[PDB]
Design an enzyme around this catalytic site. Structure first.
Site, PDB file in Angstrom:
ATOM      1  N   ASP A  17      17.288 -86.423 -55.256  1.00  0.00           N
ATOM      2  CA  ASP A  17      16.950 -86.876 -56.051  1.00  0.00           C
ATOM      3  C   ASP A  17      17.568 -85.385 -56.796  1.00  0.00           C
ATOM      4  O   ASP A  17      17.466 -84.675 -56.843  1.00  0.00           O
ATOM      5  CB  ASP A  17      15.372 -86.408 -55.784  1.00  0.00           C
ATOM      6  CG  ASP A  17      14.846 -87.287 -57.035  1.00  0.00           C
ATOM      7  OD1 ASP A  17      15.335 -87.410 -58.018  1.00  0.00           O
ATOM      8  OD2 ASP A  17      13.557 -87.581 -56.893  1.00  0.00           O
ATOM      9  N   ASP A  31       7.674 -94.762 -59.573  1.00  0.00           N
ATOM     10  CA  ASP A  31       9.018 -95.603 -59.440  1.00  0.00           C
ATOM     11  C   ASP A  31       9.099 -97.053 -60.740  1.00  0.00           C
ATOM     12  O   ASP A  31       9.756 -97.597 -61.522  1.00  0.00           O
ATOM     13  CB  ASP A  31       9.979 -95.498 -59.254  1.00  0.00           C
ATOM     14  CG  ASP A  31      10.699 -93.979 -58.313  1.00  0.00           C
ATOM     15  OD1 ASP A  31      10.212 -93.353 -59.897  1.00  0.00           O
ATOM     16  OD2 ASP A  31      10.634 -94.030 -57.849  1.00  0.00           O
ATOM     17  N   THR A  88      17.466 -90.124 -63.383  1.00  0.00           N
ATOM     18  CA  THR A  88      17.555 -88.098 -64.524  1.00  0.00           C
ATOM     19  C   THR A  88      19.223 -87.866 -63.433  1.00  0.00           C
ATOM     20  O   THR A  88      19.658 -86.172 -63.552  1.00  0.00           O
ATOM     21  CB  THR A  88      16.765 -87.324 -63.359  1.00  0.00           C
ATOM     22  OG1 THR A  88      16.743 -87.558 -62.058  1.00  0.00           O
ATOM     23  CG2 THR A  88      15.151 -87.686 -64.162  1.00  0.00           C
ATOM     24  N   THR A  89      19.168 -88.334 -62.575  1.00  0.00           N
ATOM     25  CA  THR A  89      21.407 -87.721 -62.045  1.00  0.00           C
ATOM     26  C   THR A  89      21.572 -88.719 -62.665  1.00  0.00           C
ATOM     27  O   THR A  89      23.248 -87.394 -63.355  1.00  0.00           O
ATOM     28  CB  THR A  89      21.173 -88.607 -60.938  1.00  0.00           C
ATOM     29  OG1 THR A  89      20.515 -87.908 -60.125  1.00  0.00           O
ATOM     30  CG2 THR A  89      22.806 -87.947 -60.375  1.00  0.00           C
TER      31      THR A  89
END
Lengths: 521, 528, 517
Positions: free
Chosen positions: A53, A389, A86-87
């Site tokens: 993550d 999520d 976010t990645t």
């Protein structure tokens, strides 16, 4: 020829920070996608943690580079707004920094570079809205399927049948209409040990974190109750300095008892005058929260008592319940209370958790606290993060309606359209539209690299299929190639791709605007 | 003893090092000489940053281990007391005599002969300036005051104060007349109290004929003004060097109050003792009570009902300025208090100054006193400090103008006249003293050339111009232009310097130059 | 070794480097932050986790520790702009650094004392302020609506004040004491007369400048076509203190005869009074009858006990100046007034001056019942006149967008046309620093400064130039069509602060190293 020499080199210092920022994106590049490679990080304390993550990697990476710290704040804003991606938002930032390196080599000032990214980001979102499939919150079949696919990436799969409508029905009550951003902090996920996954209760009104009084006189239930929030603690006087109680005589024993029982009763009398049925006492382990003599006094007055309330929930209960914090008993009145039809203690198995329904307030709105149960501790944990999520994906649809097909589908078509629309521009900006389109292809290219597929081969297959079709093809790791992500149940909401492009243009701007750094204390 | 870290130079390397050591120190203030001179950024050891061009402030802040440069500091202490304007000029002039002395040492001239050569040359220069000087009071009486009004304008012309300068010009004239008598012709700086505070403007500064002595009037109910009290003579004030307290022995003390019963006994006991000591003020008839120590709460209650304002916490030096202005005396104890020793003044009132919340008080006289207090204000802390030092230098010039009616015209005209006079007398006196007089005249040319350099002009070309106008035409005073003016010939622009002031500068320059030459040995120990 | 605790005096040339290269490097930190399109800077501490990013110029300069003692002075200079106004401090520091860039080019190419160059900036800054006045426009338009807003705010200020008895009359006096000025709003143009035995509502306004304490004994009560002279002298009983001076005389009459001879030398100065072609004379002290009798034969009118303050307010409205000495006849700046009339109000003799040269002013005569009613009325009125006049100097703007910056450049170039020999480079370099302001704005915006400024200067150089910097299209466009204007007070504050900033730094020849902390 002969041009401006730039004897002082503030830009070369910025180029060193760009390379240092692109080095962070190269490390996160391998972690993109569900098939991405894990990263090993050893903390200074000696803890060994691992995960793919990007939000957890950048948080524990402990970057001392100030420009590279902006990627952590973008990942924090990416999770706070969209909740996912976010990645990919960090990798997209590194591509714009890499494309800006070629712009600086052509003699282009970073101000136009940052200003052109503003029009490039606003145009990329407008093109994304044209291809986006509009969906509405009135359809409950689309929300369950969107939440079920987010729960299929976790160990819990077959039990998500009851978990999918939980996140859907919780948002539909708090969504109303045209509410724009809906804070998921209003949705409280309560983790309790025991029970099973199939056992869940929404309890839209509110849910507490604590049990009731186990001493003598605890009501454990109350009807027609008013719930206040007391930050104070009812105890005999205990100064922070050195104190001692010495009873050498029968007269000394009664003197201590009469002073303590009267001081506790005087506080109990002021509570009854305000018609306070239920009291919430802030948890303090230093001194006594509620004395046992006060429990016997408040039991005679028919006042329900719940003590040891977690300090983290004091801020949450003051909002959802529509009440106000009470520092002192003198300012403690009825106007700061709530309204509750029934307050009871319900124990599914072993939990003995208190629930409250019917707040019945105009200022307080349906703040929902959801209870999550499970056998092992690893169940309620992963379930809480999986449903979190799922709430983020649904939150994207509430603020911005519509969804798109994930897997790198919009990144290819938008890059093809901006390449054709670049002819409509002129001058320095027109070349930036071409580099901005090539920078949007790093996300689908990395997905093909981290999945083991051929880099150059899969990317060309996307440009070939997206010419005739529209958003019908993408990269899917299930079929090990280019296929239809809509038929494979891969659905990415439009707000994730919208916020990823918006935060990328703001991140690269805050980077390129730094021409120098100096020590300031 | 302590041979390590110990340096000694005698007769060989000392004569060359003493000249170069004083030359490097004097070269610091050469660019600051004159009103056009350039400022400097000074940093106190506490971290305060100040900017001023005054040579006295720059040299006073210097703490140095150089044995020769300490002689420049020892003279600067006497320069501020005697004159105060001989700070930068003399040090440059004294170093000019040292540079000419080094050239004579290389020629084989004995150092004491150089000391006696400059002493005899200085005496000849005084006689030449005594013949060519002019008189002020003989010209007119109001033209004398016109020089006093423009004396402070010259010192204030380089500062922001030059806008309101007409206010401080009158404050310097009225102050010197009161504190100085035409008999002794001396202005004592100890009789002039210099006090200033930050805030307000420079036009709000007032000239008080007596001590200020800021006080809050103790208890607030006390009146802000002191009345003559129905035809009494002046206003009688009490000067007490002993505190006002109930009598107590020197042994025990240890007063314990158990309850209200003992509280009322001690309160009435101390109040009755206050009634005995206040009678000495009533028998003497003093309107205000000024003491060196604080007062109690019950002490101000009895002074309030008797219409006797209380003044506490007054320094020892502050009490000295009170008895001099009011013609009072210092009363050591309470039993010696008498009406003959009470200070007599016109009135005491509280005057608000601008927007400042201090609200100081003013004690006036209306008759000529032996002391005054200069009160200065300004919009900046630097402006206040610069206005106090400029006023101090202005009061010293007025002292020399009255002490000696003869004056000379400065701005470079005096030094060139001294050079042409000694150079002409250099050929008339043969022998070794011939070269001693020529080197003395060449050292005098350093000041007008430094002023020519500090004015942005050729020092060599301008020096020859002043010598050409004072010879081929006629003997007069035409100096270099320090500040931008209409033309040359300072005599036309009324630039005046005191003759006794310039005479005191040239004597201190030769006095220190000898002491530097009279020391050929330097011995310093180590630092433990 | 001098001073103490690691404090020594830096080398002479190194002092100018610390005052220039050291100060410009500090100025170059906030130089890229000028304008809305400017750059940003990171500020990092020792812990490195407390850091922050901001574009504020006042935050970057104050937070960064500066070991350069010359840079510490630059921070104190920037505090003047914050206390006086508090806006545009970054533009002041940048322009102050640009003056150092030109001053470094003037020194290194000269190596002469900068004090002369300072005089070159003072003459060039005066021409820069004159160009801002000629191009000054106003949003003050519809002053009639502003008159209704000025009378309403004046009545609000009169609340809680003893003047609240009648709000309409006093607000009308302050209304006619501001809009009728058409010029400087300073309180020195408004004289306040305080008298007793009257009512506050009975006060009136007189446009003539009014004195008290009528002058002269046998002098006439009216003066027509008056010429005003200012001087300070004592013609009555000179030689104030004769005590202490040794007196050797045959008789006491020689002491008074000497005073007659001292006053006989004043007759030459009395003759210089008549050489000015004036019918009126003003003196602060008194005058004896004999030198006053000579004034009657020569046609000179003597005015006594005018003090100084009240004189300075008279010289400004009459266009005169104050001087305490006579250097030479027919060299001076004289004021004049058409009619002088001696009147009496409140049982006190007054003087009335009317028809001053270019006179713009007014006099407010207030009638109180005591000293408390008079003192509180003068202070509370000045508080209302200051706030109401604050909106007169502000909201008055000039044409912006780099235009006025280049308009001053050609105006200083006009000052560089007629100039002294050695002052040509000092004044011309001041126009170079003014042309560096549009260069920095074009560099921070991401454009070519050499192409824009050269086309901007050549267009503004000769004629018909409304043009200025247009950052949207990246070219030279008309600012009047785009509506780009900036305040005149901002232009006057930055130029005046930068001029004072150059004075503080250039007057320092050598800089002592500050104590390291």
């Amino acid at each position: 020829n002969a041009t401006f020499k730039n004897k002082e080199k503030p830009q070369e210092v910025r180029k060193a920070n760009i390379i240092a920022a692109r080095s962070v994106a190269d490390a996160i590049r391998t972690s993109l996608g569900p098939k991405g490679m894990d990263k090993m990080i050893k903390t200074s304390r000696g803890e060994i943690i691992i995960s793919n993550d990007g939000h957890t990697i950048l948080k524990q990476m402990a970057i001392l580079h100030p420009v590279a710290r902006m990627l952590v704040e973008v990942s924090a804003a990416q999770d706070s707004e969209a909740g996912d991606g976010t990645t990919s938002v960090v990798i997209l930032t590194g591509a714009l920094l890499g494309a800006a390196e070629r712009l600086l080599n052509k003699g282009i000032h970073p101000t136009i570079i940052a200003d052109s990214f503003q029009s490039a980001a606003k145009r990329s979102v407008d093109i994304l809205l044209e291809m986006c499939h509009k969906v509405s919150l009135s359809d409950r079949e689309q929300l369950v399927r969107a939440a079920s696919t987010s729960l299929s990436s976790k160990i819990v799969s077959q039990y998500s049948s009851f978990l999918a409508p939980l996140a859907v029905d919780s948002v539909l009550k708090i969504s109303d209409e045209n509410s724009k951003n809906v804070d998921l902090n209003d949705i409280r996920l309560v983790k309790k040990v025991g029970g099973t996954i199939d056992d869940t209760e929404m309890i839209d009104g509110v849910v507490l974190t604590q049990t009731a009084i186990k001493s003598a006189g605890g009501p454990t239930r109350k009807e027609k109750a008013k719930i206040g929030l007391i930050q104070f603690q009812i105890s005999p006087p205990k100064p922070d300095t050195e104190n001692n109680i010495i009873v050498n005589d029968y007269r000394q024993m009664d003197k201590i008892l009469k002073e303590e029982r009267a001081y506790l009763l005087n506080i109990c009398k002021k509570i009854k005058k305000a018609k306070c049925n239920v009291l919430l006492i802030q948890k303090s382990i230093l001194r006594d929260a509620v004395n046992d003599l006060a429990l016997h006094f408040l039991s005679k007055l028919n006042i329900m008592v719940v003590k040891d309330i977690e300090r983290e929930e004091i801020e949450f209960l003051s909002k959802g319940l529509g009440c106000k914090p009470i520092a002192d008993i003198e300012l403690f009145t009825e106007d700061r209370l709530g309204s509750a039809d029934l307050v009871e203690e319900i124990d599914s198995d072993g939990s003995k958790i208190v629930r409250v329904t019917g707040i019945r307030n105009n200022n307080a709105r349906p703040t929902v606290s959801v209870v999550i149960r499970g056998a092992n501790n690893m169940i309620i944990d992963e379930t809480e993060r999986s449903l979190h999520d799922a709430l983020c994906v649904i939150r994207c649809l509430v603020k911005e309606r519509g969804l798109i097909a994930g897997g790198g589908a919009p990144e290819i078509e938008i890059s093809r359209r901006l390449s054709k629309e670049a002819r409509s521009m002129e001058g320095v900006q027109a070349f930036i539209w071409q580099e901005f389109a090539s920078a949007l292809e790093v996300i689908p290219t990395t997905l093909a690299e981290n999945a083991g597929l051929n880099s150059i081969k899969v990317v060309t297959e996307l440009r070939s299929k997206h010419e005739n079709g529209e958003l019908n093809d993408g990269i899917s790791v299930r079929r090990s190639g280019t296929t239809n992500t809509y038929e494979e149940h891969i659905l990415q909401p439009v707000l994730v791709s919208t916020s990823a492009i918006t935060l990328a243009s703001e991140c690269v701007k805050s980077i390129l605007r730094i021409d120098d750094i100096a020590f300031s204390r | 003893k302590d041979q390590g870290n110990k340096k000694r130079q005698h007769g060989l390397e000392a004569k060359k090092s003493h000249i170069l050591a004083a030359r490097s120190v004097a070269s610091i203030i050469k660019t600051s000489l004159g009103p056009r001179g350039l400022d400097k950024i000074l940093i106190s050891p506490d971290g305060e940053i100040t900017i001023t061009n005054d040579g006295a402030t720059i040299l006073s802040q210097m703490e140095l281990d150089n044995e020769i440069a300490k002689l420049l500091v020892q003279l600067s202490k006497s320069q501020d007391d005697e004159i105060g304007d001989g700070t930068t000029g003399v040090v440059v002039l004294a170093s000019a005599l040292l540079d000419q002395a080094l050239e004579l040492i290389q020629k084989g001239i004995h150092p004491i002969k150089i000391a006696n050569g400059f002493d005899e040359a200085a005496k000849l220069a005084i006689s030449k300036l005594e013949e060519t000087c002019d008189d002020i009071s003989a010209s007119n009486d109001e033209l004398f005051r016109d020089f006093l009004l423009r004396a402070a304008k010259t010192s204030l012309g380089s500062k922001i104060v030059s806008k309101d300068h007409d206010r401080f010009a009158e404050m310097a004239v009225e102050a010197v007349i009161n504190v100085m008598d035409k008999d002794r012709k001396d202005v004592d700086f100890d009789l002039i109290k210099m006090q200033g505070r930050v805030g307000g403007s420079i036009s709000d500064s007032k000239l008080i004929n007596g001590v200020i002595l800021d006080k809050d009037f103790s208890h607030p109910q006390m009146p802000k003004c002191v009345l003559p009290k129905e035809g009494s003579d002046g206003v009688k004030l009490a000067i007490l060097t002993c505190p006002f307290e109930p009598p107590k022995p020197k042994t025990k003390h240890k007063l314990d109050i158990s309850s209200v019963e003992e509280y009322q006994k001690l309160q009435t006991y101390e109040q009755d003792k206050f009634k005995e000591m206040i009678d000495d003020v009533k028998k003497a008839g003093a309107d205000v009570v000024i003491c060196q120590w604080g007062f109690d709460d019950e002490a101000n209650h009895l002074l309030l009902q008797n219409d006797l304002p209380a003044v506490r916490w007054v320094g020892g030096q502050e009490l000295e300025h009170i008895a001099i202005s009011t013609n009072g005396r210092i009363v050591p104890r309470f039993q010696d208090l008498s009406k003959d020793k009470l200070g007599t003044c016109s009135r005491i009132y509280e005057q608000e100054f601008g927007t400042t919340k201090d609200r100081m008080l003013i004690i006036e006289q209306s008759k000529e006193t032996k002391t005054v207090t200069c009160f200065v204000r300004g919009s900046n802390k630097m402006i206040v400090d610069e206005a106090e030092r400029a006023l101090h230098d202005s009061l010293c010039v007025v002292r020399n103008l009255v002490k000696d009616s003869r004056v000379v015209y400065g701005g470079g005209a005096a030094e060139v006249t001294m050079s042409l006079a000694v150079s002409e007398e250099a050929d008339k006196q043969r022998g070794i003293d011939q070269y001693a007089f020529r080197g003395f005249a060449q050292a005098l040319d350093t000041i007008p050339m430094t002023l020519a350099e500090n004015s942005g002009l050729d020092p060599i070309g301008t020096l020859s111009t002043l010598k050409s106008k004072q010879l081929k035409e006629k003997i007069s005073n035409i100096g270099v232009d320090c500040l931008g003016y209409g033309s040359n010939d300072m005599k036309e622009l009324f630039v005046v310097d005191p003759f006794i002031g310039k005479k005191q500068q040239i004597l201190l320059a030769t006095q220190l130059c000898r002491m530097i030459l009279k020391i050929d040995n330097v011995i310093i120990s180590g630092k433990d | 070794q001098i001073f103490g605790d690691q404090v020594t005096e830096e080398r002479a040339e190194n002092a100018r480097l610390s005052a220039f290269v050291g100060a410009i490097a500090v100025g170059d930190l906030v130089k890229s932050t000028l304008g809305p399109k400017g750059m940003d800077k990171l500020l990092q501490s020792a812990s490195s986790n407390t850091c922050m990013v901001t574009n504020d110029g006042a935050t970057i300069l104050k937070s960064i520790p500066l070991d350069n003692p010359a840079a510490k002075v630059l921070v104190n200079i920037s505090k003047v702009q914050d206390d006086e106004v508090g806006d545009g401090t970054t533009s002041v520091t940048v322009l102050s650094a640009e003056l150092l860039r030109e001053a470094e080019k003037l020194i290194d190419q000269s190596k002469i004392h900068p004090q002369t160059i300072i005089e070159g900036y003072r003459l060039a800054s005066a021409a820069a302020l004159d160009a801002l006045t000629k191009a000054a426009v106003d949003n003050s338009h519809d002053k009639t609506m502003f008159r209704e807003d000025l009378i309403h705010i004046a009545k609000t200020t009169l609340s809680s004040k003893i003047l609240s008895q009648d709000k309409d009359h006093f607000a009308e006096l302050a209304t006619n004491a501001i809009l009728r000025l058409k010029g400087s709003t300073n309180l020195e143009h408004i004289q306040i007369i305080k008298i007793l035995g009257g009512k506050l509502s009975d006060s009136f306004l007189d446009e003539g400048f009014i004195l008290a304490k009528k002058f002269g004994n046998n002098q006439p009560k009216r003066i027509e076509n008056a010429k005003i002279l200012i001087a300070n002298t004592t013609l009555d009983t000179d030689k104030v203190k004769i005590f202490g001076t040794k007196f050797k005389v045959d008789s006491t009459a020689k002491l008074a005869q000497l005073e007659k001879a001292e006053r006989e030398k004043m007759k030459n100065k009395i003759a210089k009074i008549s050489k000015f072609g004036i019918n009126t004379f003003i003196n602060r002290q008194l005058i004896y009858d004999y030198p006053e009798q000579l004034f009657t034969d020569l046609g000179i009118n003597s005015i006594e006990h005018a003090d100084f303050e009240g004189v300075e307010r008279l010289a400004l409205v009459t266009g005169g100046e104050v001087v305490s000495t006579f250097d030479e006849p027919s060299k001076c700046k004289l004021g004049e007034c058409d009619v002088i009339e001696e009147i009496m109000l409140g049982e006190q003799p007054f003087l009335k001056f009317s028809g001053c040269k270019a006179g713009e002013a007014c006099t407010i005569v207030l009638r109180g019942a005591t000293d408390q009613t008079l003192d509180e009325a003068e202070r509370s009125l000045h508080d209302a006149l200051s706030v109401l006049s604050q909106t007169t100097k502000e909201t008055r703007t000039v044409l912006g967008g780099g235009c006025a910056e280049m308009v001053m450049s050609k105006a200083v170039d006009t000052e560089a046309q007629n100039i002294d020999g050695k002052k040509s480079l000092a004044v011309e370099a001041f126009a170079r620093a003014l042309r560096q302001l549009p260069t920095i704005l074009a560099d921070n915006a991401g454009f070519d400064s050499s192409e824009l400024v050269s086309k901007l200067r050549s267009s503004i150089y000769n004629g018909i130039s409304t043009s200025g910097l247009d950052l949207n299209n990246g070219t030279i466009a008309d600012m009047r069509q785009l509506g780009i204007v900036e305040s005149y007070k901002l232009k006057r504050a930055v130029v005046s602060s930068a001029s004072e900033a150059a004075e503080v730094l250039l007057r320092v020849d050598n800089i002592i190293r500050a104590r390291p902390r």
